[PDB]
Amino acid sequence: HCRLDKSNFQQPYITNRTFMLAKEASLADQNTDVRLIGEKLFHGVSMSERCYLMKQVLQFTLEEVLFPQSDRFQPYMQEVVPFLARLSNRLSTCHIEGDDLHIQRNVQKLKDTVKKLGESGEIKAIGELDLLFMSLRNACI
Amino acid sequence: DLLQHVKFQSSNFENILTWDSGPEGTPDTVYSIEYKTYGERDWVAKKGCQRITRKSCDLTVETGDLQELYYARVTAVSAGGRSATKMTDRFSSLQHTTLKPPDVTCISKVRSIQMIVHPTPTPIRAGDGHRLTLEDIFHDLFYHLELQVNRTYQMHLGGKQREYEFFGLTPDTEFLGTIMICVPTWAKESAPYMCRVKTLPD
Ligand SMILES: *[C@@H]1O[C@H](CO[C@@H]2O[C@@H](C)[C@@H](O)[C@@H](O)[C@@H]2O)[C@@H](O[C@@H]2O[C@H](CO)[C@@H](O[C@@H]3O[C@H](CO[C@H]4O[C@H](CO)[C@@H](O)[C@H](O)[C@@H]4O)[C@@H](O)[C@H](O)[C@@H]3O)[C@H](O)[C@H]2NC(C)=O)[C@H](O)[C@H]1NC(C)=O
Ligand SMILES: [Cl-]
Ligand SMILES: [U]
Ligand SMILES: [U]
Ligand SMILES: [U]
Ligand SMILES: [U]
Ligand SMILES: [U]
Ligand SMILES: [U]
């Protein structure tokens, strides 16, 4: 199902770690014109499908952002990735009861923006792990 | 050198931009402020904070969209026509804001102490333009109340409702009441509110 216990986000240490990882990367992100994760990412996505969408973003972030950058931003990277990874795993059995179009398109625009920005795009994504964390929290309860 | 510590000071969503003067600073230095929304391209000049001599600027209205994140930058122009620009880190009011003490009213009775929490209004406007309260913004917000009788025995209540009443109290006695706002999602905790009360005679 598409839901995550509230206890996954109530933990101060791993959360501050995520936010500090996000902050360190944002200081390095110089592009203030482009924001990856926001309300537009939900553009035409039913409230009951937001968690599913965030599962996709999270998965992509793990595979095309974090892993490729697992060397930078230490020592936060080292503790956060495994945390986000578990959440991703938890959602590995989350599916929607409809067509995957309006959603797929939405996630693709994000993947596209990140690729077009290249390495700095990956940096930007990390700097937005705080936004990802919260969107992920509000969408999956 | 000229500009240092450019940052937002946020309390109950009142967002004030502040900064200091660095080493090569001087008293006749003027400052000009601009702000922008993260994810947008243009910087907007803050009408009331251009060429000012003070070291703070109220950006509450400009940064009041709870869905956006912002940036602000100060441009200092020193006595010699020398200038310098510095901007804040990405700003998220939901994350950085501090919470003032709860609006609470303690009513004492013969054998119980009553505490009424009132909605705390913020500058955040809804579509219809009215003011949203902290409760409107933070859905998981809850209160933590405590009634102290002495160094070794304290009563405690908690919840999302506004009215609380501690029972089992001895008349004409003194108690120290404490109430604080808690919002777990953002790990925020308001300054405590304290009301020292005494139960009625009998
Ligand atoms: C700090 O505060 C505590 C508790 O405060 C009181 O209780 C709370 C709930 C509020 O109502 C406050 O307004 C009250 O002041 C104080 O402890 C109390 O100490 C008094 C002694 O001065 C105790 O009263 C005595 O209790 C005796 C035993 O009664 C109980 O136990 C028996 C056997 O287990 C049982 O049968 C009975 O039913 C009771 O459960 C009793 O014989 C005697 O006559 C007298 O009533 C009282 O019990 C204590 N309260 C509690 C719940 O702990 C501290 O004294 C105070 N500190 C100071 C020094 O100010
Ligand atoms: Cl409130
Ligand atoms: U992927
Ligand atoms: U899918
Ligand atoms: U200098
Ligand atoms: U203001
Ligand atoms: U907005
Ligand atoms: U009484």
XYZ file of C-alpha atoms and ligand atoms in Angstrom:
410
model
C 0.000 0.000 0.000
C 1.032 3.636 -0.321
C 1.555 4.848 3.232
C 4.348 5.239 5.793
C 4.084 5.286 9.587
C 4.396 8.710 11.193
C 7.220 7.246 13.312
C 9.462 7.258 10.226
C 9.603 11.046 10.465
C 9.400 11.686 14.238
C 13.060 10.751 14.765
C 15.078 13.945 15.553
C 18.567 12.656 14.839
C 18.058 11.116 11.381
C 15.733 13.979 10.429
C 18.140 16.746 11.437
C 20.753 14.738 9.599
C 18.663 14.807 6.436
C 17.972 18.533 6.797
C 21.638 19.252 7.464
C 22.570 17.244 4.374
C 19.998 19.248 2.455
C 21.383 22.515 3.829
C 24.988 21.696 3.021
C 24.065 20.951 -0.598
C 21.865 24.016 -0.963
C 24.761 26.257 0.104
C 26.592 24.662 -2.837
C 23.635 25.077 -5.190
C 24.074 28.470 -6.865
C 21.111 28.169 -9.246
C 18.234 29.972 -7.530
C 16.117 30.031 -10.696
C 15.264 26.335 -10.658
C 13.323 24.378 -8.047
C 12.919 20.629 -8.578
C 10.414 19.551 -5.923
C 7.255 21.632 -5.479
C 3.451 21.767 -5.853
C 3.763 21.725 -9.670
C 5.209 18.217 -9.361
C 1.675 17.214 -8.326
C 0.247 19.051 -11.357
C -2.910 17.007 -12.012
C -2.179 14.212 -9.553
C -5.082 13.120 -7.349
C -4.499 13.501 -3.619
C -4.788 9.727 -3.313
C -1.896 9.253 -5.749
C 0.642 11.689 -4.348
C 2.387 9.041 -2.243
C 2.777 6.847 -5.305
C 4.321 9.763 -7.184
C 6.718 10.507 -4.335
C 7.731 6.847 -4.401
C 8.927 7.429 -7.966
C 10.762 10.626 -7.112
C 12.398 8.960 -4.121
C 13.487 5.957 -6.214
C 14.923 8.167 -8.931
C 16.669 10.333 -6.358
C 18.224 7.249 -4.802
C 19.420 5.809 -8.102
C 20.380 8.848 -10.154
C 21.276 11.346 -7.441
C 22.419 9.956 -4.113
C 24.341 6.888 -5.312
C 26.278 8.872 -7.953
C 27.076 11.439 -5.237
C 27.657 9.022 -2.339
C 31.226 10.381 -2.148
C 30.373 14.035 -1.497
C 28.738 15.800 1.473
C 30.097 13.695 4.311
C 29.424 12.609 6.960
C 25.688 13.168 6.371
C 25.436 11.280 3.073
C 26.678 8.132 4.792
C 23.752 8.064 7.280
C 20.904 9.561 5.272
C 21.003 7.408 2.132
C 20.450 4.185 4.100
C 17.523 5.925 5.794
C 15.894 7.068 2.562
C 16.662 3.613 1.172
C 14.576 1.879 3.838
C 11.639 4.206 3.147
C 11.984 3.430 -0.540
C 11.981 -0.297 0.225
C 8.876 0.127 2.424
C 7.081 1.681 -0.548
C 8.363 -0.964 -2.985
C 4.910 -2.586 -2.665
C 2.915 0.576 -3.323
C 0.842 0.690 -6.511
C -1.969 2.786 -7.965
C -5.344 1.478 -9.139
C -5.322 3.356 -12.433
C -3.224 4.432 -15.408
C 0.367 5.663 -15.006
C 0.390 8.626 -17.425
C -0.334 11.982 -15.816
C 2.073 10.814 -13.104
C 4.844 9.344 -15.242
C 4.876 12.558 -17.297
C 5.245 14.602 -14.109
C 8.165 12.575 -12.794
C 9.832 12.628 -16.190
C 9.888 16.413 -16.264
C 11.863 16.248 -13.017
C 14.299 13.634 -14.305
C 14.724 15.789 -17.417
C 15.444 18.964 -15.475
C 17.995 17.142 -13.354
C 19.766 15.682 -16.379
C 19.812 18.998 -18.242
C 21.414 20.656 -15.219
C 23.975 17.854 -15.154
C 26.088 17.369 -12.033
C 24.800 20.610 -10.542
C 21.328 19.149 -10.971
C 22.279 16.235 -8.746
C 23.608 18.743 -6.239
C 20.332 20.654 -6.440
C 18.373 17.447 -5.761
C 20.421 16.747 -2.642
C 19.858 20.352 -1.516
C 16.152 19.658 -1.756
C 16.112 16.452 0.276
C 14.268 18.486 2.906
C 11.478 19.227 0.443
C 11.480 15.615 -0.688
C 11.357 14.434 2.949
C 8.285 16.579 3.683
C 6.432 15.986 0.402
C 7.104 12.338 1.095
C 5.750 12.736 4.626
C 2.550 14.640 3.767
C 1.682 12.409 0.794
C 2.078 9.068 2.574
C 0.532 10.186 5.901
C 34.167 42.645 5.067
C 31.284 45.079 4.622
C 28.286 42.783 4.940
C 28.000 39.798 7.293
C 25.430 37.439 8.794
C 22.637 38.096 6.307
C 19.759 36.022 7.620
C 16.051 35.736 8.372
C 14.755 36.112 11.910
C 11.405 34.317 12.035
C 8.867 34.273 14.862
C 5.232 33.202 14.446
C 5.823 33.777 10.732
C 6.890 37.371 11.150
C 9.973 37.261 8.930
C 12.582 39.936 9.555
C 15.793 40.141 7.532
C 18.868 41.147 9.529
C 22.594 41.553 8.931
C 25.771 43.012 10.463
C 28.600 45.137 9.113
C 31.897 43.324 8.661
C 35.496 44.473 9.431
C 35.816 47.262 6.845
C 32.377 48.522 7.834
C 31.344 52.094 8.675
C 28.335 53.950 10.197
C 27.337 55.944 7.071
C 26.802 52.744 5.082
C 23.461 52.400 3.290
C 21.665 49.124 2.481
C 19.274 48.037 -0.267
C 17.205 44.850 -0.085
C 15.822 42.532 -2.784
C 14.023 39.204 -2.468
C 12.962 36.374 -4.776
C 11.126 33.063 -4.828
C 13.255 29.940 -5.205
C 12.397 28.438 -8.575
C 11.803 31.849 -10.142
C 14.212 34.040 -12.069
C 13.700 37.650 -11.060
C 14.684 39.596 -7.977
C 12.205 42.147 -6.659
C 13.233 45.330 -4.887
C 11.718 45.834 -1.455
C 10.019 49.205 -1.752
C 10.602 50.295 1.831
C 14.145 48.987 2.283
C 16.252 50.908 -0.247
C 19.237 53.006 0.833
C 18.296 52.603 4.496
C 20.743 52.968 7.355
C 19.127 50.483 9.754
C 20.232 46.835 9.803
C 16.920 44.984 9.489
C 14.002 44.863 7.046
C 10.524 43.383 7.493
C 9.869 40.884 4.674
C 6.851 39.220 6.295
C 4.375 40.064 3.555
C 6.799 39.263 0.733
C 7.546 35.793 2.141
C 4.024 34.835 3.202
C 3.250 32.093 0.682
C 3.542 28.876 2.695
C 4.159 26.883 -0.472
C 7.213 28.848 -1.530
C 10.847 29.097 -0.387
C 12.761 32.375 -0.748
C 16.052 34.205 -0.865
C 16.921 37.734 0.202
C 20.030 39.783 -0.482
C 21.445 42.969 0.944
C 23.641 45.308 -1.038
C 25.781 47.589 1.093
C 27.194 50.829 -0.292
C 29.957 52.296 1.880
C 31.035 55.918 2.312
C 33.430 55.584 -0.608
C 30.973 54.306 -3.216
C 32.292 50.837 -2.373
C 29.634 48.137 -2.471
C 29.061 44.524 -1.494
C 26.251 42.012 -1.901
C 25.343 39.010 0.243
C 22.289 36.794 0.314
C 20.654 34.528 2.862
C 20.482 30.748 2.593
C 17.316 29.215 1.123
C 14.503 30.299 3.446
C 11.621 28.150 4.617
C 9.362 29.881 7.123
C 7.655 26.594 8.022
C 11.070 25.285 9.113
C 12.843 28.267 10.621
C 10.086 30.078 12.487
C 10.070 30.130 16.290
C 6.769 29.845 18.163
C 5.739 32.342 20.824
C 4.083 31.126 24.045
C 0.491 29.800 23.682
C -2.398 32.197 24.242
C -3.640 30.652 27.491
C -6.042 31.782 30.244
C -5.848 30.042 33.635
C -9.048 29.954 35.642
C -8.812 28.642 39.183
C -11.563 26.823 41.042
C -12.017 25.252 44.473
C -10.410 21.880 43.717
C -9.282 22.177 40.118
C -7.381 24.517 37.803
C -8.750 25.296 34.364
C -6.623 26.331 31.374
C -8.049 27.732 28.150
C -5.827 27.940 25.064
C -6.931 30.406 22.414
C -6.187 30.250 18.699
C -3.036 32.153 17.873
C -3.464 34.245 14.692
C -0.614 34.588 12.212
C -0.009 36.916 9.252
C -0.570 34.028 6.847
C -3.686 34.754 4.801
C -6.019 32.187 3.298
C -7.613 32.552 -0.115
C -10.520 34.545 1.323
C -7.852 36.736 2.908
C -8.474 35.956 6.592
C -5.785 34.985 9.088
C -4.691 31.395 9.596
C -3.812 30.182 13.058
C -0.909 27.970 14.037
C -3.420 25.139 14.327
C -4.566 25.787 10.747
C -0.966 25.561 9.520
C 0.399 22.726 11.643
C -2.152 19.908 11.589
C -0.274 17.740 14.078
C 0.171 20.590 16.562
C -0.639 19.640 20.155
C -0.278 21.150 23.603
C 1.702 19.894 26.571
C 0.400 21.164 29.920
C 1.803 20.770 33.423
C 0.613 21.735 36.873
C 3.366 21.860 39.482
C 2.478 21.470 43.138
C 6.022 21.129 44.502
C 9.570 20.115 43.492
C 8.472 16.471 43.736
C 5.067 15.958 42.103
C 3.789 17.357 38.815
C 0.569 16.744 36.902
C 0.444 16.688 33.109
C -2.135 16.791 30.317
C -1.843 16.930 26.540
C -3.888 17.099 23.369
C -5.232 19.127 20.487
C -8.270 20.633 22.182
C -8.247 24.072 23.801
C -9.710 23.492 27.249
C -8.019 21.501 30.021
C -8.863 21.034 33.685
C -6.638 19.464 36.328
C -8.744 17.724 39.000
C -8.004 16.461 42.505
C -6.647 19.725 43.923
C -6.718 21.009 47.516
C -8.558 24.363 47.968
C -6.870 27.691 48.728
C -3.537 26.268 47.485
C -0.923 27.548 45.055
C 0.105 25.823 41.839
C 2.387 26.634 38.915
C 0.842 26.079 35.501
C 2.936 25.593 32.349
C 1.753 25.165 28.749
C 3.830 24.792 25.590
C 3.066 24.290 21.891
C 4.411 21.178 20.207
C 4.552 20.386 16.504
C 6.379 17.034 15.975
C 6.437 17.190 12.182
C 8.852 20.110 12.312
C 10.230 19.275 15.740
C 9.160 22.737 16.913
C 8.427 23.652 20.510
C 7.067 27.002 21.641
C 8.403 29.105 24.463
C 6.526 27.967 27.550
C 3.628 29.942 28.974
C 3.477 30.015 32.749
C 0.587 31.000 34.972
C 0.979 30.812 38.746
C -2.459 30.244 40.253
C -4.159 29.443 43.540
C -7.334 27.404 44.045
C -10.299 29.143 45.660
C -10.919 28.921 49.479
C -13.897 26.571 50.109
C 3.892 17.680 47.183
O 2.607 17.249 46.729
C 2.262 15.918 47.188
C 0.905 15.590 46.600
O 0.067 16.759 46.659
C -1.237 16.466 47.058
O -1.905 15.610 46.131
C -2.043 16.160 44.805
C -2.743 15.112 43.965
C -2.812 17.490 44.862
O -4.149 17.244 45.267
C -2.150 18.453 45.853
O -2.939 19.627 45.987
C -2.013 17.775 47.214
O -1.327 18.636 48.111
C 2.249 15.857 48.727
O 2.020 14.493 49.155
C 0.906 14.272 49.962
O 1.337 14.267 51.327
C 0.235 14.178 52.250
C 0.811 14.339 53.650
O 0.931 15.709 54.012
C -0.496 12.841 52.069
O -1.687 12.835 52.890
C -1.743 11.881 53.898
O -1.989 10.608 53.291
C -1.993 9.537 54.255
C -2.061 8.238 53.480
O -3.153 8.281 52.538
C -2.889 7.588 51.344
O -2.245 6.327 51.560
C -3.010 5.380 52.346
C -2.158 4.126 52.498
O -1.410 3.853 51.320
C -4.375 5.111 51.686
O -5.171 4.303 52.542
C -5.102 6.432 51.408
O -6.312 6.182 50.709
C -4.203 7.368 50.590
O -3.935 6.792 49.317
C -3.145 9.730 55.249
O -3.117 8.696 56.220
C -3.005 11.094 55.940
O -4.137 11.335 56.769
C -2.866 12.215 54.894
O -4.092 12.375 54.197
C -0.885 12.607 50.598
O -1.274 11.252 50.437
C 0.255 12.926 49.613
N -0.282 13.003 48.266
C 0.154 12.184 47.313
C -0.878 11.670 46.324
O 1.333 11.839 47.210
C 3.584 16.376 49.288
O 3.504 16.478 50.700
C 3.890 17.753 48.703
N 5.163 18.242 49.189
C 5.183 19.238 50.070
C 6.038 19.046 51.311
O 4.535 20.279 49.921
Cl -3.485 28.165 17.106
U 15.841 4.901 -12.446
U 3.845 2.496 -12.703
U 39.715 43.021 2.216
U 4.971 44.210 8.725
U 2.582 29.795 -4.562
U -16.237 21.749 48.758
